[PDB]
Amino acid sequence: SHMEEMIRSLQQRPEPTPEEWDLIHIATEAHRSTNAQGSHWKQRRKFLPDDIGQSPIVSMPDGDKVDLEAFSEFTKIITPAITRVVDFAKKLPMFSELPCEDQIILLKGCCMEIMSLRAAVRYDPESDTLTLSGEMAVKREQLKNGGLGVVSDAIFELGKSLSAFNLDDTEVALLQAVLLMSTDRSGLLCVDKIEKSQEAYLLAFEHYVNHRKHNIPHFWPKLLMKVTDLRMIGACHASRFLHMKVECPTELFPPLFLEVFED
Ligand SMILES: Cc1cc(OCC(=O)O)cc(C)c1Cc1ccc(O)c(C(C)C)c1
């Protein structure tokens, strides 16, 4: 009984309004359809072979060498992963209504954040791998040695901790939306449309969490601190990406990878 829940409680936990449920369903299918979901075609997905990613040897300024071969294997699969993120965003109405200029900024802004989340939630405890591009299951050491350095460690620990959050497609979808609709970027026009779009998404997202009634204490603040986890991952990665670019030939960076991550 809703009225009793309402009286008895300390504060109120509103569930999604119809307008928000529409927002949630569009977001949920946006993410599902650009997730390399669990469909037929993606669930053909092999571990990265154990002899790859064990030979880090190209020196990076912070001392954490890079396995050239493992690196190449990851750049070889990264373009579709970046593209899927673009498709995700394009399928959100509040995104596509935005000036093209704003859209690029927003995607550059959050691409790694969304990719990292996407891997994070694909963390698998019995194998101790993340799944990259819906396809490649990799271990902590492999991804670490293959380019990402301590950014691998961060995604793994994020993925490990998210295990018990039992996120469903929606929660990951709305997390992405919150990440995407961020005004922590320079050079946007619709700084206010974007803030309002993030508010609506946060509002629908908490309201949805309310609906799910996870049996973790303080789920929503916790699920909010994960967002800053992700921004920190994105920021470490932007930094290691510049050092990736200093140390390695452009031949190894796929045009799109270069594009999403150049300043
Ligand atoms: C390759 C890759 C794919 C990926 O897929 C996310 C998804 O499922 O869409 C998610 C992550 C986190 C990575 C890893 C990655 C992410 C950024 C980056 O600069 C590098 C270089 C070492 C090639 C690797």
Numbering used by the authors: 145 to 407
Please give the exact wording used by the authors of the publication that reports this structure.
Thyroid receptor (TR) activation occurs when an agonist ligand such as TH or similar compounds binds to a hydrophobic pocket in the core of its ligand-binding domain (LBD).
In the second crystal form (C2 space group) Arg 228 is in another non-productive conformation (in white) which is an intermediate between two conformations of the same residue found in the first crystal form. Differential positioning of the Arg228 side chain is related to hydrogen bond with the Ser277 carbonyl group that flips the Arg228 side chain into an alternative conformation. This weakens direct interaction with Arg228 and forces GC-1 into a new conformation which involves re-orientation of its carboxyl group. This means that Ser277 fails to engage in a hydrogen bond contact with Arg228 analogous to that observed between Asn331 and Arg282. Thus, Arg228 is not anchored by contacts with the subtype specific residue.
